[PDB]
């Protein structure tokens, strides 16, 4: 029931020979795994933690100047010198001013002038980095037991969370009553934390590209620097003003916090106050359902009366969830649940909370099932007092096919070349598709890095037009496909 | 002389008294008393709702977030009528004086 | 049974506490305190002065 009520649900159906399935886990998403003899499980990536961050650069977003000094030299005497030019905590500039008898000079020319001021940082943004071995993905595996944890906390069940680290990427959950599940994850491929910086700025943290971070035009410290006083690009945070040729001056350029916020658009925000927590990204895992068994398959039908205690509702995914209570004898019984037609001649829908059972009489169990599009009837119980529930599913099968194609394409857009692993059961077609996607995505990312979505749409339109106005059919079709894919990615790029 | 203020821009603000209101799917928009006040910046959006968070339906429930906007620094922009435009000129003859 | 109200619509209103403020030409916009809360319906316009 944890995975219900989340609009980004994914249904992964089927395990291969070996009883394993490849599932990508995303933070905002959730995965419901359906296997034939296995119970239905819900997998959610609820946390990614980076530990032991190391700073590589401390940028200055707000500074001040305190000790301004000037040296002036008469024309043809060369540029002047201040003793504080050697000082790395001072920012200096060389200019020229008009000189002559009026200035106490005696030569009437452009006399070089140098002005220096002490650069002091008042606000900085850290750029901590983390080693890929220090990530820790937390995952919650919850099965469709149809039951609840129960408020009585003296016993706490149904809450198995597994931590996955690059060192320990294989772990098993012990779901009570359902055996155990094995997750064979690959954290080292989910995110390249050697090309990412945990940018923290005034109680707000972002995850950013490392080259982008190193390219920022603000003054920076090495990161091990413990006293400031050696800022590198101090000239980017100051301005030297020589109106006409009378005097030279230097002033600071105000807090760069808002300009940084503008620069950070397109960077995913993370948390860095109580640990470095990243609620973004994906995990590729292999699900080992071999030692996963349905609970209570030795039980018998209830042969009793059920009452609906939570009225049937339709989730955002085309399934229906209902909560029924059993009022009969033989408490540990399988619940007779069918999605038939009006005459009950055909089975039209397949339930999702597979093998719904009653463990205690006074313990409601909520069933999730997938009805067909249109009229359908939910039948619960057996002939005496059997409760028959009607339902109408408003969609269309063609509409569902379109929605699933759209969802698959969107997954490809986000997890490019990793979308081939979301539900893959091995196979040769999946491998060929993934290899082709890797080869094509290498070129696409090379040719489209650092381009805004508007530029992507423009380039897609241009390429589509070029392909349309192409004599060669072999070139025209390829160009049109490239243009349409570019247009799609540009229309669904910013996230 | 005597410039007149034409507009004050805010360059540094702060948000306080943040509040939110939610409504179940298909039941319309949530209401916040602070929406009436213009010192509060507000936005309407949709969140996932369902049995888990107390709704009988499983759609996109509307939500409204309101926070009080307070300005901390200004960028006042003033204007001057050309009449109050004292220019100053210095005329020095080539008298040849020593200084 | 037990329907939930989705929206109220105003078919008969009234106006009270009318206020106005002007600013000299090229000095920007007039400012009214009543413009602060959304109970007051307001509009900006130009009148020669």
């Amino acid at each position, epitope marked *: 029931m944890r995975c219900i009520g989340i609009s980004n649900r994914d249904f992964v159906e089927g395990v291969s020979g070996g009883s394993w399935v490849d599932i990508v886990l995303e933070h905002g998403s959730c995965v419901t795994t359906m296997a034939k003899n296995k119970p239905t499980l819900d997998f959610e990536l609820i946390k990614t933690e980076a530990k032991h961050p190391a700073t590589l650069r401390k940028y200055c977003i707000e500074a001040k100047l305190t000790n301004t000094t000037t040296a002036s030299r008469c024309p043809t005497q060369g540029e002047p010198s201040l003793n504080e030019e050697q000082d790395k905590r001072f920012v200096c500039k060389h200019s020229m001013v008009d000189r002559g008898w009026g200035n106490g000079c005696g030569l009437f020319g452009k006399g070089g002038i140098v002005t220096c001021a002490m650069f002091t940082c008042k606000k900085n943004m850290e750029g901590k980095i983390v080693q890929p071995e220090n990530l820790e993905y937390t995952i919650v595996i919850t099965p469709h037991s149809g039951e609840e944890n129960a408020v009585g*906390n*003296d016993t706490g069940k149904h809450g198995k969370e597994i931590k996955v680290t690059p060192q320990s990427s294989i772990t098993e959950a012990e779901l009570t009553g359902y055996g155990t599940v094995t997750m064979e994850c690959s954290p080292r491929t989910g995110l390249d934390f050697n090309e990412m910086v945990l940018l923290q700025m005034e109680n707000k943290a972002w995850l950013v590209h490392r080259q982008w971070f190193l390219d920022l035009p603000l003054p920076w410290l090495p990161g091990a620097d413990t006293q400031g006083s050696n800022w590198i690009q101090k000239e980017t945070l100051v301005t030297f003003k020589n109106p006409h040729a009378k005097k030279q001056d230097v002033v600071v350029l105000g807090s760069q916090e808002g300009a940084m916020h503008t620069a950070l658009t397109g960077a995913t925000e993370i948390q860095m106050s109580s640990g470095n927590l990243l609620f973004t990204g994906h995990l590729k895992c292999r699900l080992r359902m071999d030692k996963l068994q349905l609970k209570g398959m030795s039980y018998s039908m209830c042969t009793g009366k059920f009452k609906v205690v939570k009225e049937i509702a339709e989730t955002q995914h085309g399934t229906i969830v209902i909560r029924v209570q059993y009022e009969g004898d033989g408490s540990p019984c399988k619940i007779p649940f069918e999605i038939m037609d009006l005459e009950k001649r055909h089975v039209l829908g397949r339930l999702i909370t597979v093998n719904p059972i009653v463990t205690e009489k006074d313990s409601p169990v909520n069933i999730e099932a997938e009805p067909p599009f249109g009229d359908s009837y939910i039948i619960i119980g057996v002939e005496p007092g059997q409760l028959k529930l009607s339902w109408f599913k408003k969609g269309s099968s063609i509409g569902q096919m379109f929605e699933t194609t759209m969802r698959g394409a969107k997954r490809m857009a986000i997890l490019g070349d990793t979308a081939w692993d979301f539900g893959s059961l091995g196979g040769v077609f999946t491998s060929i598709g993934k290899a082709l996607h890797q080869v094509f995505g290498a070129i696409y990312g090379a040719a489209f890095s650092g381009v805004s979505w508007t530029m992507k749409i423009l380039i897609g339109v241009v390429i589509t037009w070029i392909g349309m106005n192409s004599r060669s059919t072999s070139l025209s079709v390829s160009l049109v496909l490239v243009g349409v894919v570019t247009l799609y990615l540009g229309v669904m790029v910013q996230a | 002389k005597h410039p007149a203020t034409l507009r004050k821009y805010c360059i540094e603000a702060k948000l306080t008294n943040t509040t*939110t209101a939610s409504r179940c799917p298909t039941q319309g928009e949530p209401s916040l008393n602070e929406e009436q006040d213009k010192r509060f910046v507000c936005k309407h959006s949709m969140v996932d709702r369902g049995w888990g968070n107390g709704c009988g339906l499983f759609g996109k429930g509307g939500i409204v977030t309101c926070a009080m906007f307070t300005c901390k620094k200004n960028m006042e922009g003033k204007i001057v009528q050309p009449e109050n435009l004292e220019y100053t000129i210095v005329i020095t003859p080539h008298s040849g004086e020593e200084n | 049974k037990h329907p939930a109200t989705l929206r109220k619509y105003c078919i008969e209103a009234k106006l009270t506490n009318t206020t106005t403020a002007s600013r000299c030409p090229t000095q920007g916009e007039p400012s009214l305190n009543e413009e602060q809360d959304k109970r007051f319906v307001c509009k900006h316009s130009m009148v020669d002065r």
Partner: antibody, heavy 126, light 109 residues
């Protein structure tokens, strides 16, 4: 066992301030939000506000908003409810009730079984 | 904004007695955050029902909850002497606060 224990009863005079604590044990203190609920002698339960032990966030009732301050001590797994400028109407038992926050650490939507565990109740008189 | 409940209620032992909690479209008419608390004298409130109908693990099955429009109801079927207590209704409102009922005193005699 998940037991919630609050400080002992206290006697204060009108115009003073009182701090009440609620010690949480048997569960991860940071995973749940702490609610303060006061009940005047022989009257209805009244909600005051909650503290999110995970991040120290708080939400107070419009009433009590200006007088009540809620704080937590992650080290001790303890929550505090400071009521300032006590009046004759503030004499009542002050209960603490928990509600789990979501896995993000954000406590905005409660759990259906909010207030499942309560403290014994601290009595304050003015 | 307090949820409205009858001041008092009495039922003969072994009978069934119902309690009402009338609220607004935001507290108990808009959301399923309806909870019933039982408070014996000198003791903290005890969660009797939640999500309208769901009852805690230790809570007897004699306690049943219903909700209709802006009103949520609590019913007791056994009416044992131990059931005589003060019952409070609470709801999580649309603005993010908790409102409590005025409480009903149930007496068996």
């Amino acid at each position: 066992e998940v037991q919630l224990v609050e400080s002992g009863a206290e006697v204060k005079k009108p115009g003073a301030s009182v701090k009440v604590s609620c010690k949480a044990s048997g569960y991860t203190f940071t995973s749940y939000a702490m609610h303060w609920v006061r009940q005047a002698p022989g009257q209805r339960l009244e909600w005051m506000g909650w503290i999110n032990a995970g991040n120290g966030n708080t939400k107070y009732s419009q009433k009590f908003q200006d007088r009540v301050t809620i704080t937590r001590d992650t080290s001790a797994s303890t929550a505090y409810m400071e009521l300032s400028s006590l009046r004759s109407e503030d004499t009542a038992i002050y209960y603490c009730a928990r509600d789990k926050v979501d896995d993000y650490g954000d406590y905005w939507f409660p759990t259906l079984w909010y207030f499942d565990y309560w403290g014994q109740g601290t009595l304050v008189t003015v | 904004s307090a949820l409205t409940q009858p001041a008092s209620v009495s039922g003969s032992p072994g009978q069934s007695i119902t309690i009402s909690c009338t609220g607004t479209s935001s507290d108990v008419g808009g959301f399923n955050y309806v909870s019933w608390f039982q408070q014996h004298p000198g003791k903290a409130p005890k969660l009797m029902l939640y999500d309208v109908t769901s009852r805690p693990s230790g809570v007897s099955s004699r306690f049943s909850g219903s909700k209709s429009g802006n009103t949520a109801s609590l019913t007791i079927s056994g009416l044992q002497a131990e059931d005589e207590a003060d019952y409070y209704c609470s709801s999580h409102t649309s603005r993010g606060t908790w409102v409590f009922g005025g409480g009903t005193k149930l007496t068996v005699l």
